DNA sequence: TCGACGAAATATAAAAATTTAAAACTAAGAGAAA
């Protein structure tokens, strides 16, 4: 992590090539998708930049429409554009912890956190960074397991990040 | 044998459910077998179940059969 | 400490996992993946009350399946009485609990390369296994093998390869490691005999096998017609609340079920003593406990 | 497309609101299986309307096996009449349906090995144990049993409109998973 | 000795409803050893 930080900040690229920089994605690799999983809403002063976890791609329609399983296929909750896709979710060596899945998982692994991004704008749901996982992956927390942590500093730093942002 | 099926027909025509009674009468069966035969006889013979319902033979066989081997 | 209690449990899990792996003959990285899945299981409030062999068997199976291998649940359950299907049920329960993603495929080509050495071996070990996987690759695309016990289809393909080639072996000796019933085995063999024209069976099967459509699975034949011959509109979808409202739940509605049921709800009291005689004869000690 | 699922099985329960014992009910019953050493609950079978509801000592009965929703509540009313006439008051209220099971055929063959790899988020495929694919749908919560034969078990919903919505939701999945 | 059928075992989704482990999780208790 440190070597990657000091190598990428040793920190730019070629302008106007980033539109063509998306390329052909083979079937099988896990694909990370943007905020509009099935709903697109006004995320809380958004700095998460892709906002959810990876999924597996099984089929492709065209060069700008890829099929990958997110929800049930009702009302076409299966395909999105390539502008909402990314590629890289790798190096478990650098990121030891897996992806927490259940609330009973979340209760026990709750006291291992890195950062808090922002509350989901729908009703109450928290979006957070966990520890020893890549920052691209994100983990969803609710208020049920949010009371068993040092969370005072978490919404404190979220408040001062909001102060910096707006 | 078909004679065992005839005897079971007579037993179900005599009284209601007697799974413990016929299980103890024949020391080689179980609850699953008599439940299975009740399930497969409730559907394939619509006239026989109604005939057993409207017949209700007196228990002149089970009481005597409970003493021959026990 | 909180971290101290984890170490003893993980050590016990490692000891049991290594004990089973010593008889399963699995590589090191498979056991490492199984142990990390066991750590994930403990992180998910590990299922209590289960037998220890069940959860370690499930973790070993999912680790051996995450990379394409050949091990079968019978090998997990091969200690003189294990009741393999209970292990399968525990694995099915842990599928949803552990939330398995990136599921592995089910292709029996790797099965033949491991079943070859025990039953129906070859001098070069190139002929029979390649013949079996070559016929299986095209029999898979005919939509015939779908959820039909991959060990069974592997054994059937091995038997078909032995039949088309020359190999003096006992037909019934394959059940030692395959563990497949003879009824479904001969069903799959004569299904292959039915779906193939047998044009060059004595020498070598057809080298250009293409069956585009034209065939159906046997279960489709059984229950597509749902009998024996020998995007709708939302208005067309009624709600079932009116069905529940049709029957009145009124307290005074106690006489709407008079269809000779009122004369025969319960047993008559004149035969109560007659029932009680055989009841105290047999069903007497059954209540004192 | 136009195929409608068939209403096949309904699971429902009611509470009679009395802390009774069931040995009294079992001692006076025309057709009722009961074993005190195992449980204190009595399984009773009636010819019509083909229901096998299970009564509990807590004062509640779970009605299962009814072909129709009318038949389920009518059988529950009959059992309420029985328990009124044997030894108890046991008022019949608070009807609630927990699960409705239906089966229907889609009439064209479905790819399932491709379906297992594609919809594996909501599917659980295990050919070593169960031939069918268990589709564990989340929203709405109906669990489907997809088969290559096209006969789909449709358990999970407590209503009929939910059943129809699940069928029309999963029909495009089988539409793209056709066999040519 | 190949074909012909019957039938329990599972999933399945609930509501339930008494007993049985049963394996993480604490907590003494000894034994080291600078």
UniProtKB/Swiss-Prot annotation, chain A:
TM region positions: none
Name listed for the protein in its UniProt record: Integrase p58
Organism: Saccharomyces cerevisiae (strain ATCC 204508 / S288c) (Baker's yeast)
Residues of the full protein shown: 1355 to 1522 of 1547
Curated annotation (Swiss-Prot), chain B:
Localization per record: Nucleus
Positions of the SANT domain: 1-46
TM ranges: none
Subunit structure: TFIIIB comprises the TATA-binding protein (TBP), the B-related factor (BRF) and the B'' component (BDP1). Interacts with TFC4.
Known role: General activator of RNA polymerase III transcription.
Family the UniProt entry places it in: Belongs to the TFC5 family.
Name recorded for this polypeptide: Transcription factor TFIIIB component B''
Protein's organism: Saccharomyces cerevisiae (strain ATCC 204508 / S288c) (Baker's yeast)
Highest classification ranks of the organism: Eukaryota, Fungi, Dikarya, Ascomycota, Saccharomycotina
Shown chain mapped onto the complete sequence: 421 to 490 of 594
UniProtKB/Swiss-Prot annotation, chain C:
Transcription recorded as keyword: yes
Protein family: Belongs to the TFIIB family.
Subunit record text: TFIIIB comprises the TATA-binding protein (TBP), the B-related factor (BRF) and the B' component (TFC5).
Sequence repeats: 20-96, 115-194
Name used for this protein in its record: Transcription factor IIIB 70 kDa subunit
Subcellular location: Nucleus
GO MF entry, a single one: RNA polymerase III core binding
Species this protein is from: Saccharomyces cerevisiae (strain ATCC 204508 / S288c) (Baker's yeast)
Miscellaneous section: Present with 4330 molecules/cell in log phase SD medium.
Residues of the signal peptide: none
One GO cellular component, as annotated: transcription preinitiation complex
BP GO terms, sorted: DNA-templated transcription initiation; DNA-templated transcription open complex formation; regulation of transcription by RNA polymerase III; RNA polymerase III preinitiation complex assembly; transcription by RNA polymerase III
Described purpose of this protein according to its UniProt entry: General activator of RNA polymerase III transcription. Interacts with TBP. Binds to Pol III subunit C34 and to the TAU135 component of TFIIIC.
Keywords linked to the UniProt accession: Activator, Metal-binding, Nucleus, Phosphoprotein, Repeat, Transcription, Transcription regulation, Zinc, Zinc-finger
UniProtKB/Swiss-Prot annotation, chain D:
GO molecular function: chromatin binding; disordered domain specific binding; DNA binding, bending; DNA-binding transcription factor binding; RNA polymerase I general transcription initiation factor binding; RNA polymerase II core promoter sequence-specific DNA binding; RNA polymerase II general transcription initiation factor activity; RNA polymerase II-specific DNA-binding transcription factor binding
Residue pairs linked by disulfide bridges in the UniProt entry: none
Entry keyword annotation includes Signal: no
GO terms for biological process, alphabetical: DNA-templated transcription initiation; negative regulation of DNA-templated transcription; nucleolar large rRNA transcription by RNA polymerase I; positive regulation of transcription by RNA polymerase II; regulation of transcription by RNA polymerase III; RNA polymerase I preinitiation complex assembly; RNA polymerase II preinitiation complex assembly; RNA polymerase III preinitiation complex assembly
Keywords: DNA-binding, Nucleus, Repeat, Transcription
Compartments it resides in: Nucleus
The keyword Membrane is annotated on this UniProt entry: no
Gene Ontology CC terms: nucleoplasm; nucleus; protein-containing complex; transcription factor TFIIA complex; transcription factor TFIID complex; transcription factor TFIIIB complex; transcription regulator complex
Sequence repeat coordinates: 7-83, 97-174
Family (UniProt): Belongs to the TBP family.
Protein's name in the database: TATA-box-binding protein
Organism: Saccharomyces cerevisiae (strain ATCC 204508 / S288c)
Gene behind this protein: SPT15
Residue range from the parent sequence: 61 to 240 of 240
